[PDB]
Design an enzyme around this catalytic site. Structure first.
Site, PDB file in Angstrom:
ATOM      1  N   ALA A 166       0.720  -1.234  -0.056  1.00  0.00           N
ATOM      2  CA  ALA A 166       0.028   0.092  -0.014  1.00  0.00           C
ATOM      3  C   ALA A 166       0.841   1.106   0.206  1.00  0.00           C
ATOM      4  O   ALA A 166       0.397   2.459  -0.402  1.00  0.00           O
ATOM      5  CB  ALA A 166      -0.712  -0.148   1.151  1.00  0.00           C
ATOM      6  N   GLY A 170       2.342   5.991  -3.111  1.00  0.00           N
ATOM      7  CA  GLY A 170       1.017   5.127  -2.459  1.00  0.00           C
ATOM      8  C   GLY A 170       0.971   3.800  -3.299  1.00  0.00           C
ATOM      9  O   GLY A 170       1.975   3.244  -3.629  1.00  0.00           O
ATOM     10  N   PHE A 171      -0.189   3.346  -3.344  1.00  0.00           N
ATOM     11  CA  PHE A 171      -0.463   2.059  -3.969  1.00  0.00           C
ATOM     12  C   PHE A 171      -0.342   2.112  -5.660  1.00  0.00           C
ATOM     13  O   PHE A 171      -0.981   2.865  -6.186  1.00  0.00           O
ATOM     14  CB  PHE A 171      -1.992   1.750  -3.747  1.00  0.00           C
ATOM     15  N   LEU A 172       0.542   1.148  -6.063  1.00  0.00           N
ATOM     16  CA  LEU A 172       0.987   1.210  -7.501  1.00  0.00           C
ATOM     17  C   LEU A 172       0.874   2.289  -8.334  1.00  0.00           C
ATOM     18  O   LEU A 172       0.232   2.652  -9.083  1.00  0.00           O
ATOM     19  CB  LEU A 172      -0.202   0.034  -8.229  1.00  0.00           C
ATOM     20  N   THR A 194      -1.882   6.931  -5.404  1.00  0.00           N
ATOM     21  CA  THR A 194      -3.023   6.581  -4.795  1.00  0.00           C
ATOM     22  C   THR A 194      -2.831   6.518  -3.300  1.00  0.00           C
ATOM     23  O   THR A 194      -2.282   5.872  -2.673  1.00  0.00           O
ATOM     24  CB  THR A 194      -3.807   5.175  -5.572  1.00  0.00           C
TER      25      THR A 194
END
Ligand code: HEC
Ligand code: HEC
Ligand code: HEC
Ligand code: HEC
Ligand SMILES: [Ca+2]
Ligand SMILES: [Ca+2]
Lengths: 354, 125, 376, 376, 125, 355
Positions: free
Chosen positions: D47, D68-70, D87
């Site tokens: 995450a 952040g996430f991917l 994200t």
């Protein structure tokens, strides 16, 4: 004998003597040449069926009888979801409890009572022979025994190989006998990876021995009223079709507007679609689901009318969890889904595909 | 241990990368994080969306359709990580891609990835 | 000798062969019991962290809880909930900071409260369990603040709201005794009793000094709330015991975990959670090894067990691995938990024989805190 | 032979011993040049994630960027900025989602624009470099969306504003040709040209299908925007080249990276960024190794080099490690970067001889993507 | 290499855990993330608060007060991890305790940990 | 020579003939018995000094000469930090450039001009001898050479070990001759791990040869006006002491309100503190700093008045970066810091430490 019983039901199924004015039979509305549905045009198209009186129209689409033998009897299962039964709203427990109801229904076969049916049966020498040979002598002299016995034979007829052959393309492909096209296989893949399989698959997981593409559950998918059908039914513009809640004994308001998941077997040849025949095209049925998923303006529009689909007849109890999947079906995916659903057409009804 | 060799399935340990149902799994096996072969760990949210694969079972010699579904709304479990790619296709054939986070349709619009399950949804064909 | 992976496969196959259906769903964790054990992974000061909920008896991860930057876990003794104080930023490690408490249901693991802490007051420090604490009635969470000065936060769990900050002297850690009273260890070497309410200056009473300035008490003492027993080791393995069960601090006599001979040869406590206390058996457990004197955060390979009324050694286990933290289940025939930061693995031992029974691995990047509940 | 850590050691020693003062401060990175290389760590779907800024010449981490996430990294060709779309969530991995673009100064590493993306539009997938892309003026960032349908997001960097979503057909990837035009790759086998204004429906025009349904083009093609050269391998090693420099797609002779005899011995590309492209030398580099057909995401141990114009093999390197991702520096005497996810190490090679020159390790948890800037 | 053994300082490599100034560091060596022995890497914020140790320098035989300071506002580097505790004391003696994130006084109120620098402030007493 | 020059300076320092009504010498305001500071009570206590006319007061506290010879000459360094010079606002470049100014300043010694200084030196036969052996004949006949020469000698004298003996306990401790008490030691440890070391240490990193607990920089820490002092000075209620900016040459308005970090040596015996002598007690000067960190209502309050610290005289260019540490000094640490700062008392003034 299980064979005799069903053979007796084959006579009754096509006998107009079972209607008041002898103008219709089960086969009138569930035509064997159209996968046991109604090919006739009434004031609301093929959306609804005309009764024996030649005027009265019902308020619901007449489903196929094909594969309804596989539907388990009505019951609430351990997760609190009602399953099975018969009629779009499950108000009969099974094929046996169901078979007497069209007979006595004033907007269908319109017989005045069980005695009248018994009088009609007793007037035929083959029924006296056939019935008493299976249910004992004097069966046709008792209204209740007779009527009950006519239901039994009809149900047994429906549970024979002719109503549920399992010889569609999908079946032969699962038997290794042949191969989907590319487009068809894409469709199946889309069917089992998109939200459909949450409702139109027998099991949640594992393989079904006799798949009918329905988990027998009840769901409100938020369909609108069919304006014209509802006008023809004469039930009034103040009426609301409450689906499963209308079954006597169901008191849970959470069941308002919920209807049994139909089998998609023979779906291509049984339009118009849904409990109130609102959609004529199979393509349109599929695209209705896009309205919970898509952001494009076109998904707010019913392609058969040009207008907004319309508000739900029953705005509460939508199955939003399943319906709000977050992925829209492009046209290439809608095409494939149609193509695959065509492969659920039984052998004998493949000629109709065109 | 030879990563470039043909994959060889087994049916005796669901927490191993070569368990037969994980033939196109990408992420973590939920059994190792409080879930089970086909259930999500508590706290997490189950997607509706899936990617699919045809997985050969060496026990009964049949092939099954595994609709892999993600458990979401948690950081990645870190337990029993796995990447297999049996019949795996590029993103432009998405029903068979596995680099995608198939969290769509999960409760609460949960979209982070915790682990995956491996439920049979069909016979292959 | 069949593993859990192996049983699950065998059952999956029979479900398949039998045609047993089941709906893919969201599991519930089994109900909180004595042999539940939580592991927290501060993840070497990473901005986002993980807690692992484990059944000690099976050796199975039964759940996880996500957390932020250096969260402090607690676990209600009755099993009725679990909770943490945690910290997050508007952009990963940067921007606006929000400190909050979350209360989770112990079997759904779902949040039942999210209580915001005003003015970002938590102490950001390598996780010490007694820097955040529940009161014995499970109604109130207390947390330490370092900055701008020592102070204690009071959070009402039942009403799901923050109440007030408490000004305190130069003290550290928080050992609740009552709904409205806790104890702290101060820099002068006394304990301080803090009696508080919703508003007003709290009544703060110092104990007598119980150790010299040059004896060092570790950051990880064991405190059994249900026994009122504070158990505090020093760098040398001398063990202070304070009895608070009366509501005032009674100093028990000290005991030496290690013999004079072993001390002479360099034996010392060491690691992170270096001590455990079992209430019902009245025993103390201590991670010890042969080390130089300023290697007190290194892992250890041995545990000494002793009677807490006498100081008599009961046993010296060889753990078989590098162990940083220990704790015990609080039932009869208790398990002894041995957590290895280095291996990211919880070894589960019989506390009577010290025999390794089973292990749980892949427990994050740097697991360090073991928490149990005293449900007896 | 003297390491960087060693040199640093002598300098500090020499300052200390000469009484040189110096203010502890925030460093700046050295100026963006050809040998700068960025390595992204998706962290096996974690995450929060990290980007590593490295000097290829020295083999040194010179900075870092949290994400952040991917996230999808972009790097401006002229070195004037770096950026990513990322994200985050209000409680780690749960709660309210914020998608956003951040633009950074490439020597201070400070954010200069934070641009929120409405209705959580980003495509969450294992990082493919061309799912988020800069227009060649550098004034616009285009990002792909999968849910509920393929679409493209237009962000204005210059005015620091998300503008709108472009509706597109069933197409994948974003290859920008002009300030108002890009290409995608559609399911049927074409490319789609999408010409867009500041408002209105975009103009979309398909090419012919340039490959069959049974021929599988990978998720990591190389695109030189300054060349207008798209270089797209298939699972078996064949190589499509699309010329977009005219502003329309002219399809060059397909080439074969492997020879039929090698292909029959199971030589096949494999890994993550399986292909690189050097603009000046008009040269293609490709990760290949012997494998079964469905181990395409496994690491490879060889790189073949070929001429782009003719398709003739120029060299075949034995990399010596498990390599997952390649790229090159776009100066003369280019370096060849070989990133090992398993090893968490960037291996920096001479792209002429394919010799290993140096390496940089501890690159996060599972590093995957290499980005350079074509500054020539 | 024996973690329980007496620490032994060297003065020839600042990216090793046995470098002499690293005698009571806890976290990550800042040189390994684009900083330097005594400077924070770009993008991070320099704490004003510190904790001290007296480190022996094997180059000139003297001991030095090192006031460690954090670089904050970024997730931890992960490169060149180190934990040493020569002279390190428990929390109740905070000036000497290194468990604490000493990020106080950083610009923008940064409080997340990234790496640590090791500047000299004076000789030992 | 370096000897003789300073011996001459030692005479001029205690010679009141350098003042208009000859009531006053350097040593009146810079008393060797009180670490080179003013013990006398004027209208504002010991905050500011009374001139030779018995009446006029300055607007600024008289600092210590002790250790002033270690301050580099005024300059801007590579960071754009002005450093050094003499006076609280650095308006003199070094000790010599400074030495003249008191003699000609009308609120202080108040001579009318250089020629009258020369006229006073010239009247002393011991001045004609010393001056002419060092600066050659006729020096005292040329006003500009004689005044310059007087400065030269006063600066030499200030650069002796009398003014910078490095014999404080802190020094002796540092040379391994004694040890700190635990409290002094805890005070020292606090000093070097809190924000003080960011200004009250010679260097940014490393070790100084000759530490004087000041980095010779310029900073505004947000002090209020001392009213009793400002009234006594008669500069007017609308006057604003711009600190460094008031140096001729400086025009950067970012230097407004910035003054020179004073060496902390002998701080224990040279109160009142800060440029305007606004705080009587060492303890109060330490506590002032809590105003930038603490939240307690007591931290906005000056314990000497029982009222708020005050509005800054110049409410801009505050060194908030260093001052907002995020950490409040508890009483233990203030006790500790007091203790440690007493160890910076030169041996000869340790007796003074009692009162
Ligand atoms: C007579 C021979 C001398 C000498 C050699 C010095 N002084 Fe004074 N002094 C006084 C006051 C109030 C201050 C501060 C004023 C300001 O900042 O404008 C000073 C300052 C100095 C310094 C600068 C010291 C520093 O550290 O910045 C020096 C080197 C110095 N003095 C030497 C007060 C007085 C008087 C008040 C009546 C008299 C008389 C003098 N000083 C005389 C001399
Ligand atoms: C003139 C119309 C008409 C006649 C006559 C009629 N049906 Fe129907 N049938 C319907 C309609 C419409 C429905 C759906 C009605 C509803 O759900 O309320 C229906 C529903 C059913 C169902 C429930 C199927 C399902 O999937 O829920 C069965 C079984 C059935 N009919 C069998 C029969 C049999 C057996 C006869 C006569 C022996 C018969 N029908 C006569 C119109 C007719
Ligand atoms: C959670 C429930 C649910 C989901 C998801 C769902 N359906 Fe249905 N579907 C139903 C129910 C219930 C009906 C009957 C509704 C009614 O008429 O009131 C229905 C009707 C249909 C019909 C008309 C059949 C007939 O004879 O009239 C088609 C075709 C159909 N669905 C296809 C699909 C496809 C294709 C998908 C997804 C790709 C899908 N459905 C998803 C519940 C679902
Ligand atoms: C960033 C600058 C800065 C920081 C941080 C700082 N100081 Fe100072 N200090 C000064 C300046 C400048 C003065 C002179 C101020 C004035 O007179 O206007 C001063 C004056 C003092 C004085 C009065 C000395 C005198 O001769 O009048 C004492 C005592 C003192 N400081 C102690 C401390 C202590 C103790 C700390 C921290 C624990 C501290 N200071 C932190 C800049 C600083
Ligand atoms: Ca129909
Ligand atoms: Ca003074």
């Amino acid at each position: 004998a299980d064979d005799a019983l069903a053979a007796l039901g084959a006579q009754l199924f096509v006998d107009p003597a079972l209607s008041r004015n002898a103008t219709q039979s089960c086969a009138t509305c569930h035509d064997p040449a159209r996968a046991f549905t109604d090919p006739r045009e009434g004031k609301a198209g093929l959306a609804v069926s005309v009764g024996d009186d030649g005027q009265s129209h019902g308020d619901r689409n007449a489903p196929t009888l094909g594969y309804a033998a596989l539907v388990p009897a009505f019951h609430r299962d351990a997760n609190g979801k009602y399953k099975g039964g018969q009629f779009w709203d499950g108000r009969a427990d099974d094929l046996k409890q169901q078979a007497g109801q069209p007979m006595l229904n004033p907007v269908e076969m319109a017989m005045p009572d069980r005695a009248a049916v018994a009088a009609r049966l007793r007037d035929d020498p083959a029924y006296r022979t056939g019935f008493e040979a299976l249910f004992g002598k004097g069966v046709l002299d008792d209204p209740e025994r007779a009527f009950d016995a006519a239901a039994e034979a009809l149900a047994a007829y429906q549970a024979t190989g002719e109503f549920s052959p399992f010889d569609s393309k999908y079946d032969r492909v699962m038997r290794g006998e042949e191969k989907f096209t590319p487009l068809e296989e894409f469709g199946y893949t889309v069917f089992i990876t998109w939200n459909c399989r949450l409702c139109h698959m027998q099991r949640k997981q594992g393989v079904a021995e006799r798949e009918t593409f329905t988990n027998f559950e009840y769901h409100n998918i938020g369909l609108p009223v069919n304006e014209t059908a509802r006008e023809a039914s004469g039930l009034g513009a103040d009426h609301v079709d409450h689906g499963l809640l209308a079954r006597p004994g169901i008191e849970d308001p959470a069941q308002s507007g919920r209807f049994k998941v139909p089998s998609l077997r023979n779906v291509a040849v049984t339009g118009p679609y849904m409990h109130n025949g609102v959609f004529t095209d199979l393509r349109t049925a599929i695209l209705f689901y896009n309205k919970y998923t898509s952001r494009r303006p076109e998904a707010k529009i019913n392609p058969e009318t040009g207008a907004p689909w319309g508000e739900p007849e029953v705005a509460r109890n939508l199955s939003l969890a399943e319906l709000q999947s977050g992925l829209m079906l492009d046209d290439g995916r809608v095409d494939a889904l149609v193509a695959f659903l065509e492969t659920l057409t039984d052998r004998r009804y493949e000629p109709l595909l065109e | 241990t030879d990563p470039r060799a043909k994959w060889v399935p087994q049916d005796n340990d669901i927490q191993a990368c070569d368990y037969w149902r994980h033939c196109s799994i990408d992420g973590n096996i939920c059994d190792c994080s409080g879930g089970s072969l086909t259930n999500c760990p508590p706290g997490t949210k189950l997607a509706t969306a899936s990617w699919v694969a045809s997985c050969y079972n060496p026990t009964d010699g049949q092939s099954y359709l595994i609709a892999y579904r993600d458990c979401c709304g948690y950081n990645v479990s870190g337990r029993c990580p796995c990447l297999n790619t049996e019949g795996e296709l590029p993103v432009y054939r998405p029903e068979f891609a596995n680099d995608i986070i198939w969290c769509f349709g999960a409760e609460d619009d949960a979209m982070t990835y915790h682990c995956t399950i491996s439920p049979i949804v069909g016979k292959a064909s | 000798q069949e593993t859990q992976g192996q049983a699950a496969a065998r059952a999956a196959a029979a479900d398949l062969a039998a045609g047993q259906d089941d709906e893919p769903r969201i599991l519930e964790a089994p109900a909180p019991d004595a042999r539940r054990v939580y592991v927290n992974d501060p993840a070497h000061f990473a901005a986002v962290t993980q807690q692992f909920v484990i059944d000690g008896e099976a050796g199975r991860v039964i759940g996880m809880i996500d957390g932020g930057f250096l969260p402090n876990p607690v676990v209600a003794d009755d099993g009725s909930f679990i909770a943490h104080a945690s910290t997050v930023f508007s952009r990963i490690a940067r921007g606006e900071r929000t400190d909050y408490v979350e209360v989770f249901d112990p079997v759904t693991l779902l949040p039942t409260a999210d209580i915001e802490l005003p003015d970002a007051p938590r102490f950001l420090v390598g996780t010490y369990p007694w820097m955040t604490s529940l009161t014995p009635d499970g109604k109130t969470l207390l947390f330490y603040q370092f900055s701008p000065a020592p102070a204690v936060g009071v959070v009402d769990l039942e009403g799901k709201a923050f109440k007030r900050m408490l000004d305190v002297p130069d003290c550290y850690h928080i050992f609740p005794t009552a709904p409205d009273t806790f104890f702290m260890h101060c820099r002068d070497g006394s304990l301080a009793k803090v009696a508080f309410g919703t508003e007003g200056t709290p009544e703060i009473t110092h104990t007598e000094v119980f150790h010299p300035e040059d004896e060092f008490l570790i950051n990880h003492p064991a405190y059994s709330q249900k026994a009122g027993r504070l158990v505090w080791p020093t760098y040398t393995g001398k063990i202070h015991q304070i009895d608070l069960s009366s509501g005032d601090a009674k100093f028990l006599p000290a005991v030496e975990a290690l013999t004079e001979a072993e001390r002479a040869d360099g034996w010392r406590p060491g690691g992170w959670q270096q001590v455990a206390y079992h209430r019902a058996l009245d025993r103390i457990y201590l991670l010890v090894d042969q080390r130089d004197e300023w290697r007190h955060k290194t892992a250890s390979r041995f545990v000494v067990v002793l009677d807490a009324k006498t100081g008599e050694r009961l046993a010296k286990f060889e753990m078989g691995h590098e162990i940083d933290s220990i704790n015990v289940s609080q039932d009869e025939k208790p398990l002894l938990y041995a957590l290895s930061t280095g291996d990211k693995t919880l070894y589960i031992h019989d506390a009577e024989s010290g025999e390794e029974l089973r292990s749980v691995n892949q427990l994050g990047h740097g697991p360090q805190v073991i928490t149990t509940a005293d449900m007896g």
